[PDB]
């Protein structure tokens, strides 16, 4: 619920995710990327199950790779589950999609998986 | 286009996505196949389609499916505007079942 | 159907898949958009579509793209038989770039 | 090349994969599953880049979940790269597809990632 999720997290590549879980199931924050065309901080928005069922808490968020300094013409979404305890982790799968011409659309989307550790 | 995106859309199975695209890159609206709140972002200065993504947690006042889907794709405008997507649906699971927690698929939305 | 699967198929972009389905569950054949060898398996006793998958390493006598695609899906027979798939294309990369090694997409093949 | 790949491997869930890499780029072997409707050994087939480029070697394989004892009406494909050294590993992403009725086709496919360690 709010506090579990709210906080600073890092993935296995050294990117940072700062998130506030709101009472209505809203997720807002900032993302700072360890890779790609990514310079500085980017806004993030998402949603989580604010009334979860030993099972994890399902959540997802999106970043569009545009800030006041750069624009990668691409957006990533991460879908996963928050698993609490002392070992708090967020286990995700993500899709990165770039804006493409129609011809190149077949190769517009990357897929990968990230694990977030809470700090 | 910002307000190119703004509107009501439908996918292949009859689900309906109502969205507003903000000047600064925000997407907000509701998804129904009952109704759920969505939030996302899009490139507000595209070159190419416009990249975008959004999430829906499957909980509202009536049901809680303890899952959340994210759609990642691009908007292509023109005479017949479309949003081509791939999505990941993750369910809250115990550790024993975490390996079978995520479904993947694709959706094509149109104004029709 | 074993020999329901056997035949020549085309996807949305004009690639052509020539396949033979063996009695015991083997798939063999070639894929061309030049030609590459494919191998896979399918459920030879289906209930529902027939589950199946195949791989193509993108190397032949003429080119080597140092990648390999796998297609996972099901065969649906009837008047207009189709093979609905999702695929993963992985490229051989250095460790620095391993996070951007895999493309995901979907393909629909038909006899037309 | 052949020998690098050829051998016995296990994933993080305790499944086993026994594979022989052939000279023409063929992969044949057997898979024994730690989960699902999966009883005993199942045949596998796939392909690999027999002439790879510090970069890994791209490969993929499929198992249909049918043997003489069980049938799950489903097939999985794993796509990834073999990374050699002492730390030999195969890093993959997989798609599991079940045979479904048309109505249920939207939820026929699972996605996940596995890491294989050589034994």
């Amino acid at each position: 619920a709010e506090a579990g999720i709210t906080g600073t997290w890092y993935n296995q590549l050294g990117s940072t995710f700062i998130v506030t879980a709101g009472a209505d199931g809203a997720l807002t924050g900032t993302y700072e990327s360890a890779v790609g065309n990514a310079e500085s901080r980017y806004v993030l928005t998402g949603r989580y199950d604010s009334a979860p069922a030993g099972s994890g808490t399902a959540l997802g968020w999106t970043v569009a790779w545009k800030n006041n300094y750069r624009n990668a013409h691409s957006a990533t979404t991460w879908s996963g589950q928050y698993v609490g305890g002392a070992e708090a982790r967020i286990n995700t799968q993500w899709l990165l999609t770039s804006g493409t011409t129609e011809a190149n659309a077949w190769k517009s989307t990357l897929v990968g998986h990230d694990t977030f550790t809470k700090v």
Side-chain angles (χ1 to χ4, degrees), chain A:
Chain A
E2 313 70 311
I5 298 167
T6 298
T8 298
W9 305 71
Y10 293 106
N11 72 13
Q12 69 296 335
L13 298 173
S15 310
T16 302
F17 162 58
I18 287 150
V19 65
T20 284
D24 59 343
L27 237 32
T28 67
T30 196
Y31 201 96
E32 300 193 51
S33 163
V35 291
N37 170 282
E39 164 167 31
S40 183
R41 195 183 302 278
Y42 292 90
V43 155
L44 77 89
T45 200
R47 305 289 301 159
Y48 74 101
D49 174 1
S50 55
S55 294
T57 300
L59 86 181
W61 70 89
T62 304
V63 170
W65 299 105
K66 190 224 180 282
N67 59 14
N68 299 149
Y69 301 103
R70 317 307 272 259
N71 188 353
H73 294 313
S74 59
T76 295
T77 56
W78 280 264
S79 174
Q81 63 189 126
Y82 160 81
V83 177
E87 286 288 310
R89 278 276 173 325
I90 289 174
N91 288 321
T92 60
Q93 300 190 271
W94 49 257
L95 296 183
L96 169 47
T97 299
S98 289
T100 68
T101 62
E102 151 195 290
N104 291 328
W106 76 267
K107 47 180 167 298
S108 67
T109 308
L110 286 174
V111 55
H113 48 85
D114 276 356
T115 307
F116 293 87
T117 287
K118 193 189 193 171
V119 139

